[PDB]
Every structure is written in structure tokens, then in C-alpha cells.
Design an enzyme around this catalytic site. Structure first.
Site, PDB file in Angstrom:
ATOM      1  N   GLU A  39     -14.105 -26.472 -17.053  1.00 11.74           N
ATOM      2  CA  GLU A  39     -14.509 -26.134 -18.410  1.00 11.74           C
ATOM      3  C   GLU A  39     -15.582 -27.065 -18.959  1.00 11.74           C
ATOM      4  O   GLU A  39     -16.217 -26.718 -19.960  1.00 11.74           O
ATOM      5  CB  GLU A  39     -13.294 -26.147 -19.340  1.00 11.74           C
ATOM      6  CG  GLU A  39     -12.277 -25.059 -19.040  1.00 11.74           C
ATOM      7  CD  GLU A  39     -12.716 -23.702 -19.553  1.00 11.74           C
ATOM      8  OE1 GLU A  39     -13.585 -23.658 -20.449  1.00 11.74           O
ATOM      9  OE2 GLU A  39     -12.198 -22.680 -19.057  1.00 11.74           O
TER      10      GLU A  39
ATOM     11  N   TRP B  99     -16.872   3.636   3.489  1.00  9.92           N
ATOM     12  CA  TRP B  99     -16.313   2.373   3.012  1.00  9.92           C
ATOM     13  C   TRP B  99     -15.785   1.527   4.162  1.00  9.92           C
ATOM     14  O   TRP B  99     -15.902   0.296   4.141  1.00  9.92           O
ATOM     15  CB  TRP B  99     -15.201   2.645   1.997  1.00  9.92           C
ATOM     16  CG  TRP B  99     -14.608   1.405   1.394  1.00  9.92           C
ATOM     17  CD1 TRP B  99     -13.405   0.843   1.708  1.00  9.92           C
ATOM     18  CD2 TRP B  99     -15.184   0.576   0.379  1.00  9.92           C
ATOM     19  NE1 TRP B  99     -13.195  -0.284   0.953  1.00  9.92           N
ATOM     20  CE2 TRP B  99     -14.272  -0.471   0.128  1.00  9.92           C
ATOM     21  CE3 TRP B  99     -16.380   0.614  -0.342  1.00  9.92           C
ATOM     22  CZ2 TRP B  99     -14.521  -1.467  -0.812  1.00  9.92           C
ATOM     23  CZ3 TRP B  99     -16.623  -0.378  -1.275  1.00  9.92           C
ATOM     24  CH2 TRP B  99     -15.699  -1.404  -1.501  1.00  9.92           C
TER      25      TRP B  99
ATOM     26  N   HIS C 142     -18.753 -25.503 -19.177  1.00  9.55           N
ATOM     27  CA  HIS C 142     -18.600 -24.460 -20.179  1.00  9.55           C
ATOM     28  C   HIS C 142     -18.621 -25.021 -21.592  1.00  9.55           C
ATOM     29  O   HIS C 142     -18.914 -24.278 -22.534  1.00  9.55           O
ATOM     30  CB  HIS C 142     -17.300 -23.691 -19.940  1.00  9.55           C
ATOM     31  CG  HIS C 142     -17.267 -22.950 -18.640  1.00  9.55           C
ATOM     32  ND1 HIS C 142     -16.678 -23.466 -17.505  1.00  9.55           N
ATOM     33  CD2 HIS C 142     -17.753 -21.736 -18.293  1.00  9.55           C
ATOM     34  CE1 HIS C 142     -16.801 -22.598 -16.517  1.00  9.55           C
ATOM     35  NE2 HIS C 142     -17.449 -21.539 -16.968  1.00  9.55           N
TER      36      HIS C 142
ATOM     37  N   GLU D 181     -21.359 -19.384 -16.182  1.00  7.86           N
ATOM     38  CA  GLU D 181     -20.422 -19.816 -15.155  1.00  7.86           C
ATOM     39  C   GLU D 181     -21.081 -20.635 -14.056  1.00  7.86           C
ATOM     40  O   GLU D 181     -20.401 -21.019 -13.099  1.00  7.86           O
ATOM     41  CB  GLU D 181     -19.718 -18.601 -14.544  1.00  7.86           C
ATOM     42  CG  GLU D 181     -18.471 -18.168 -15.298  1.00  7.86           C
ATOM     43  CD  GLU D 181     -17.199 -18.712 -14.682  1.00  7.86           C
ATOM     44  OE1 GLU D 181     -17.201 -19.002 -13.468  1.00  7.86           O
ATOM     45  OE2 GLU D 181     -16.196 -18.854 -15.413  1.00  7.86           O
TER      46      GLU D 181
ATOM     47  N   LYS E  77     -18.086  -1.263   7.143  1.00  8.13           N
ATOM     48  CA  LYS E  77     -17.414  -2.556   7.179  1.00  8.13           C
ATOM     49  C   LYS E  77     -17.417  -3.145   8.586  1.00  8.13           C
ATOM     50  O   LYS E  77     -17.619  -4.351   8.762  1.00  8.13           O
ATOM     51  CB  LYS E  77     -15.984  -2.403   6.664  1.00  8.13           C
ATOM     52  CG  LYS E  77     -15.432  -3.633   5.977  1.00  8.13           C
ATOM     53  CD  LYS E  77     -16.124  -3.818   4.641  1.00  8.13           C
ATOM     54  CE  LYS E  77     -15.470  -2.953   3.579  1.00  8.13           C
ATOM     55  NZ  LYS E  77     -16.460  -2.460   2.580  1.00  8.13           N
TER      56      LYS E  77
ATOM     57  N   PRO F 135      -6.949 -21.762 -19.048  1.00  8.12           N
ATOM     58  CA  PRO F 135      -7.840 -22.291 -20.084  1.00  8.12           C
ATOM     59  C   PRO F 135      -8.301 -21.197 -21.033  1.00  8.12           C
ATOM     60  O   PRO F 135      -8.497 -20.044 -20.642  1.00  8.12           O
ATOM     61  CB  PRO F 135      -9.015 -22.867 -19.284  1.00  8.12           C
ATOM     62  CG  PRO F 135      -8.960 -22.167 -17.964  1.00  8.12           C
ATOM     63  CD  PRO F 135      -7.507 -21.930 -17.696  1.00  8.12           C
TER      64      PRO F 135
ATOM     65  N   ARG G 157       0.823  -1.203   0.000  1.00  6.78           N
ATOM     66  CA  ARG G 157       0.000   0.000   0.000  1.00  6.78           C
ATOM     67  C   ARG G 157       0.860   1.257   0.000  1.00  6.78           C
ATOM     68  O   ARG G 157       0.655   2.147  -0.835  1.00  6.78           O
ATOM     69  CB  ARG G 157      -0.965  -0.013   1.183  1.00  6.78           C
ATOM     70  CG  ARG G 157      -2.113  -0.980   0.975  1.00  6.78           C
ATOM     71  CD  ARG G 157      -3.265  -0.266   0.283  1.00  6.78           C
ATOM     72  NE  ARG G 157      -4.333  -1.177  -0.109  1.00  6.78           N
ATOM     73  CZ  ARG G 157      -4.312  -1.919  -1.209  1.00  6.78           C
ATOM     74  NH1 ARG G 157      -3.286  -1.889  -2.044  1.00  6.78           N
ATOM     75  NH2 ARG G 157      -5.348  -2.708  -1.480  1.00  6.78           N
TER      76      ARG G 157
ATOM     77  N   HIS H  85     -10.577  -4.508 -11.289  1.00  8.25           N
ATOM     78  CA  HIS H  85     -11.994  -4.380 -11.615  1.00  8.25           C
ATOM     79  C   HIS H  85     -12.464  -2.939 -11.479  1.00  8.25           C
ATOM     80  O   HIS H  85     -13.198  -2.435 -12.336  1.00  8.25           O
ATOM     81  CB  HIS H  85     -12.822  -5.299 -10.717  1.00  8.25           C
ATOM     82  CG  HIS H  85     -12.534  -6.756 -10.912  1.00  8.25           C
ATOM     83  ND1 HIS H  85     -11.371  -7.349 -10.466  1.00  8.25           N
ATOM     84  CD2 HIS H  85     -13.256  -7.737 -11.501  1.00  8.25           C
ATOM     85  CE1 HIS H  85     -11.390  -8.634 -10.775  1.00  8.25           C
ATOM     86  NE2 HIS H  85     -12.523  -8.895 -11.402  1.00  8.25           N
TER      87      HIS H  85
END
Ligand SMILES: CC(=O)N[C@@H]1[C@@H](O)[C@H](O)[C@@H](CO)O[C@H]1O
Ligand SMILES: CC(=O)N[C@@H]1[C@@H](O)[C@H](O)[C@@H](CO)O[C@H]1O
Ligand SMILES: *[C@@H]1O[C@H](CO)[C@@H](O)[C@H](O)[C@H]1NC(C)=O
Ligand SMILES: *[C@@H]1O[C@H](CO)[C@@H](O)[C@H](O)[C@H]1NC(C)=O
Lengths: 49, 595
Positions: B356, B458, B359, B383, B462, B327, B150, B486
């Protein structure tokens, strides 16, 4: 559509716009002959016969 | 000369020209991965460059649509895709560095250096941190490993969040919407359909609903930890309090997979594991895939087509050729599907390829569908089928027809508690983070959270809501919602959200029809035509009908079920009631590292 028991000639270049091409190439449409990309992983239905 | 006359034929002609170029992108992935050539590296990039941006040139005339009714086919749904214009609303100068700033911290995270005392040896985040995760019993190293990471970069991630929200929301404004979260609900949006219409904002409320079934799972594990983990770490583990998140097998506490060490049932009874007893028939690399193929007939799934035998590698390359351990399986259609690991004589090949497997078999069910609608009922259906049967692929009692069981069944609880708790480790540690992160995005998208309550909350929520502790809180000096790929690339958890509970219902669908009662680990899924008939409907129905109709059919109940989750591990939860009935339940919010 084609008529029964007669042979097809593929010469005309189709244009998406209903206005005629008039000898000028257009957009969003191409020559109507399709070259199928043949991979060995294609299914039997996809395989040419 | 009508433009509608033009569009009617143009749309039909476009779907076939699109597929030829769409198919080529995934094929170059393996070829480039094994030998890099100038043609090889550019194939996917120049193939896909005529898909998204070039779509608008074909899409310009899609705004001239009328209250014409003749469109009643699923075509109206592909027509929305023909109506997309893309990011053309964005100015070039303000989007010139948007791509540059979007991926700036990804390079720093990948090229990251973890400071170490005396600089004895080089260290890295992955897998250097996980390698020495439990090498010693030093709290200082566990704190400093993440503290130094961090203190390296996390302070400078704050400017990433400035233009990201504005630019994301500007897509909604250009798309006659106020919020982009309502734009994400296109798969869940249906109109002019009687009694089968769903609202975009309704999927907002499930965050409150889905957490009611999460606390019962967390409570049972915490009672187990209360018995054993006080002795190992007594300085930061209080029995009436939150379970620490800085002593588990994770840097951030996201995946609680490495909980077996801290929750081992008995240190005097080793777990049963047979390796040499299994090799009496000359176990080789082909044996694992042969047993995987035999697994197909015990699950009623048909064998996959010729693509199984050429595009998928089932043996070591044996040369200097380098292969991809990750994969790579895509829904190209036309029989092109892959199962690809770093294929050697390894036990991991048993499990990863099985992931898989679901899938694979799903795709041929809707491969015949157009690529624009080549998917299941929702985004999480892809999924979901790949993991439901994976739980049955590790249980050897369901492997009676394997030939390697020797079904001298142990006296139930005495053995099963040792094994089943391990699988419980899969179902416990991922619920809280998925729950908390999905909430934050939806509130921040609309903007009702004030700036004074957007950062501190945030960590404020928590402590009380989920009940977890952090090594170092970040108030206005580190940007915690900026340290993940993300968040840094505008990704959400809607991929893992809808299937999270629905997978258990999918697995229970294979047993409820078969009239099987009790725990779900003794369910026989062999030679069952009733289960295959049910599985063969919605696999092939696809996206032709609105998802609302399929939602009622697939589960049968409009509400969520909690007893299937607790029934697969019934002895595990029941045994903890006797030893914890005379104890305080839950945790106290008063004690926490708030000060
Ligand atoms: C430098 C390099 O990548 N060389 C590879 C070679 O190892 C491989 O055998 C060949 C495929 O036949 O492709 C090329
Ligand atoms: C006996 C043993 O330990 N392992 C296997 C057994 O499961 C299997 O049935 C037999 C032949 O089928 O080969 C051996
Ligand atoms: C399961 O319950 C039985 C009932 O007597 C008990 O003997 C056994 O020890 C239990 N198993 C475990 C792992 O606690
Ligand atoms: C499925 O297993 C065998 C087929 O090998 C058969 O004898 C049996 O009756 C079938 N049904 C069940 C419930 O085992």
C-alpha cells in the site's frame, strides 16, 4: 463578486436555469450555504482556521 | 437564457456538490466492518446511489453542445463524463434479471462443496485445497480436487454467456459504436491534438507484441525444471515438452507462486533466515512500522499526513473488535488515506503494508486534482508504483542502513542463486495467463471468431501457442470461460496489462538516472535527489495532458525493453546455460494431451 470592505448577505436561492425560480425550488442547484464536513483526518489547509 | 450559459455555471457548481457525497462512501466501510447498525450498513449504498444513476439527470443538457471552440481546457475531458447517460437504453424487463443472473454463479462458487471419498471431513475450495496442496504425493487427489469442483457446477455455467455478450455490445450500439472494446479505450482516446493522438484499435496489437519477451523467461525456468522434476513426477513430465500445469501450487495454474518446492536449488543447504538475531532490541509490533517509516527516507518519499495516524491502525485492537485483513485504501483526497492490515506482531505486516505504500504516496500527488481526473497517466499506473519498490523491501543488502544487515557479504552466486530464484518465481508464472485471457476478450467482442471456433479454440490454441497442459479439457460440456468471477461480472485484465512490463522500466528509471550499471539488486536508492526530482514530475502532472505525451516522457523509448528483465537475475539465467547448452531447446508441440 463582492466589493471591498463590505459585508455579504447570502439570501438568494440560486437556480441553474437562468429563468428565475419565482418562489419555486429547482433542480441541480440548492441553497448556497455549504456546511463543510469536518473530519479529524483533514489536512491543515482543509482544516478551518 | 442560453442553455450553454446554464451549463457553464452548472458544471462548475456540480464538482463541489459531488465531492461531499463521494467522500462519505469509503468512511462507512470500516465503521460497518466493526459494528453493523441500520444507519451503518446503508451509508455507502445510499451515498453512491445518487452518483451513477442520478448523474444522468444532471447530464441531460450535455447533448446540446456545439462546434464552439471556447472549451480548450481539460474541461472537454470532464465534459465527456458530463455527457454520460448510463444504461438508460436498456429495457427494465430485460435488465430486471440481468443483475440476478450476473451474480448467480458467484454465490455458488463461494458456497461450493468439494466431494470427498468417505466424507471423512468437510472440504472447501479455499483454503481447503491450498492447505493440502502438497500434503501428499497423490496425483489422484490433485486431479479429483478440481474434477469434483467442475462436475459440481461448471456444466450449468453455459447459459450465463448468452445474454452477456449481447447486452455488453448493446452499450456500444447505444453509444454510436460497434464494439464495447473501443468504448473501453476512453482513457486512451485523444482527438484534435497535434502529433499526440492515439488510436483505440492500436492497443489491440500489443498482445502479439508482448509475448515475444515472455518466451525467453519461460524457457530458462523449463531447463531448470528438466533437471529436477523428472524424479519426482516421471509419469507426466517429459524433458522435450511443455511444463505440466497440474503439478504446481495452483488449482488453475494462474499464480505460480508455490514453485520453490519443485525448484529448490539444494536440499542440503538451508536458506538464510534470522529472527532471534533481529530481536536484540525488543522487537515488537511497532518495530515493523518504525522500520517502514525509516524506509521512507531511504526512498525519498515524504511522510504522509495526519491521516497516517488516526485512520490507519498500527496495533492490535486487543478486544473482541474484529478487523479487516484485506487492506482498504481509497483516493478520497483531503488527507483521507488508510493503511490497514490485521495489525498484530506478524512478519507479514512488513510486506502487505509496503504494498500500500506506493498506493499512498501517489495519491497526494494528484489528490488535489478533481475526482473525475484523480489518477495517473493510465489505469495501470496506480498499481505499478506500489510493487516496484516492494522488491527492494525484501533484499537485506539494500538494507545496509537498517542496522540489521551485518554486511559480511557472501561470495556472490553461491548465496544469491538461492534467494534470487524465489523472486524469479514472481515474474514467470503470471505472464502466460494474462497474455492468453486478454486476447480472447478482444476477439470475442467484435465477433469475428465463429461459434464453431469460439469454444474448442479455447483449448486448441492453448496446446500450441502458450504450451500448457490441462487436467481436463472442456469442449462443449464445461464452459471454461464462465468459471471465473471476472468473466461472470464483465471484468478485463487491462488493470494488470499495461503496468506488467512498465513496472520494470519504472524501477530501472531510478537506477539509469543514478548511473548504476549491472544487476538491479545492488542499486542504492538512498539520499538520491536526482531520482526524487524525476519521480516528482509525473506524479503531480496527473491527467491534465494527453497520456501520449506522458508515455514518451516516462519510459523514453517507444518500444519495449527486454534486457532490464534479464539483468536483475543475470547469474540465474547465465548459470543454466552451461548445463543446458548441450540439450534440445524449447518444447515439441507434437506431444500433448490432445488425445
Ligand atoms: C456486537 C458488536 O459489534 N459490538 C461492538 C463492540 O464490540 C465495540 O466495542 C463497539 C465500538 O465501541 O461497537 C459495537
Ligand atoms: C548485532 C546484530 O546482530 N544486530 C543488531 C545490529 O545490526 C545493530 O547495529 C545494533 C545496534 O544498532 O543492534 C544489534
Ligand atoms: C556461481 O558461479 C561460481 C563460479 O565458479 C560457482 O563456483 C558457484 O557454484 C555458482 N553458484 C551456484 C549457486 O551455482
Ligand atoms: C548517501 O549516503 C550517505 C548519507 O547517509 C552519504 O555519505 C553518501 O555519500 C550518499 N551517497 C551515496 C551514493 O551513498
Amino acid at each position: 463578486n463582492l466589493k471591498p470592505f463590505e459585508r455579504d448577505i447570502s439570501t438568494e436561492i440560486y437556480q441553474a436555469g437562468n429563468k428565475p425560480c419565482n418562489g419555486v425550488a429547482g433542480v441541480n442547484c440548492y441553497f448556497p450555504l455549504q456546511s463543510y464536513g469536518f473530519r479529524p483526518t483533514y489536512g491543515v489547509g482543509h482544516q478551518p482556521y | 437564457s442560453t442553455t450553454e450559459e446554464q451549463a457553464k455555471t452548472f458544471l462548475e457548481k456540480f464538482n463541489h456538490e459531488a465531492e461531499d457525497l463521494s467522500y462519505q462512501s469509503s468512511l462507512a466501510s470500516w465503521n460497518y466492518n466493526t459494528n453493523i447498525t441500520d444507519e451503518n450498513v446503508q451509508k455507502m449504498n445510499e451515498a453512491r446511489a445518487k452518483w451513477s444513476a442520478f448523474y444522468e439527470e444532471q447530464s441531460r443538457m450535455a447533448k446540446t453542445y456545439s462546434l464552439e471552440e471556447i472549451q480548450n481546457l481539460t474541461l472537454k475531458r470532464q465534459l465527456k463524463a458530463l455527457q454520460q447517460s448510463g444504461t438508460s437504453v436498456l429495457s427494465a424487463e430485460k435488465s430486471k434479471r440481468l443483475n440476478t443472473i450476473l451474480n448467480t454463479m458467484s454465490t455458488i462458487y463461494s458456497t461450493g462443496k468439494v466431494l470427498d471419498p468417505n466424507t471423512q471431513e468437510c472440504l472447501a475450495l479455499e483454503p481447503g485445497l491450498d492447505d493440502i496442496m502438497e500434503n501428499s504425493r497423490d496425483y489422484n487427489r490433485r486431479l479429483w480436487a478440481w474434477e469434483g469442483w467442475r462436475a459440481e457446477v461448471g456444466k450449468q455455467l453455459r447459459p450465463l454467456y448468452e445474454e452477456y455478450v449481447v447486452l455488453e455490445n448493446e452499450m456500444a450500439r447505444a453509444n454510436n459504436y460497434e464494439d464495447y472494446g473501443d468504448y473501453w479505450r476512453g482513457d486512451y482516446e485523444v482527438t484534435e491534438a497535434g502529433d499526440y493522438d492515439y488510436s483505440r484499435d492500436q492497443l489491440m496489437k500489443d498482445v502479439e507484441n508482448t509475448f515475444a519477451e515472455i518466451k525467453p523467461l519461460y524457457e530458462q525456468l523449463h531447463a531448470y525444471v528438466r533437471a529436477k522434476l523428472m524424479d519426482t513426477y516421471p509419469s507426466y513430465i517429459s524433458p522435450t515438452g511443455c511444463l505440466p500445469a497440474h503439478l504446481l501450487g495452483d488449482m488453475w495454474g494462474r499464480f505460480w507462486t508455490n514453485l520453490y518446492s519443485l525448484t529448490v536449488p539444494f536440499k542440503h543447504k538451508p536458506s538464510i533466515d534470522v529472527t532471534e538475531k533481529m530481536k536484540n532490541q525488543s522487537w515488537d509490533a511497532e518495530r515493523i512500522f518504525k522500520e517502514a517509516e525509516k524506509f521512507f527516507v531511504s526512498i525519498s518519499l515524504p511522510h504522509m499526513t495526519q491521516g497516517f495516524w488516526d485512520n490507519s491502525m498500527l496495533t492490535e485492537p486487543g478486544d473482541g473488535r474484529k478487523v479487516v485483513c484485506h487492506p482498504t485504501a481509497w483516493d478520497l483526497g483531503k488527507g483521507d488515506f488508510r493503511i490497514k492490515m490485521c495489525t498484530k506482531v506478524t512478519m507479514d505486516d512488513f510486506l502487505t503494508a509496503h504494498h500500500e505504500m506506493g498506493h499512498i504516496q501517489y495519491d497526494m500527488a494528484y489528490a488535489a486534482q478533481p475526482y473525475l481526473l484523480r489518477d495517473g497517466a493510465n489505469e495501470g499506473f496506480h498499481e505499478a508504483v506500489g510493487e516496484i519498490m516492494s522488491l527492494s523491501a525484501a533484499t537485506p543488502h539494500y538494507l545496509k542502513a537498517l542496522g540489521l544487515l551485518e554486511p559480511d557479504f557472501y561470495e556472490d552466486n553461491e548465496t544469491e542463486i538461492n534467494f534470487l530464484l524465489k523472486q524469479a518465481l514472481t515474474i514467470v508464472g503470471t505472464l502466460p495467463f494474462t497474455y492468453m485471457l486478454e486476447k480472447w476478450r478482444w476477439m470475442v467482442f467484435k465477433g469475428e471468431i465463429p461459434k464453431e471456433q469460439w469454444m474448442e479454440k479455447w483449448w486448441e490454441m492453448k496446446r500450441e501457442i502458450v504450451g500448457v497442459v490441462e487436467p481436463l479439457p472442456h469442449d462443449e460440456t464445461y464452459c471454461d470461460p464462465a468459471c471465473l468471477f471476472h468473466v461472470a461480472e464483465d471484468y478485463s485484465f487491462i488493470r494488470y496489462y499495461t503496468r506488467t512490463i512498465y513496472q520494470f522500466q519504472f524501477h530501472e528509471a531510478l537506477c539509469k538516472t543514478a548511473n548504476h550499471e549491472g544487476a538491479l539488486f545492488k542499486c542504492d536508492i538512498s539520499n538520491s535527489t536526482e531520482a526524487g526530482q524525476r519521480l516528482l514530475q509525473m506524479l503531480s502532472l496527473g491527467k491534465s495532458e494527453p497520456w501520449t505525451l506522458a508515455l514518451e516522457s516516462i519510459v523514453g523509448i517507444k518500444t519495449m525493453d527486454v534486457k532490464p528483465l534479464l539483468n536483475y537475475f543475470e547469474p540465474l539465467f547465465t548459470w543454466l546455460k552451461e548445463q543446458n547448452r548441450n540439450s534440445f531447446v524449447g518444447w515439441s508441440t507434437e506431444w500433448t494431451p490432445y488425445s
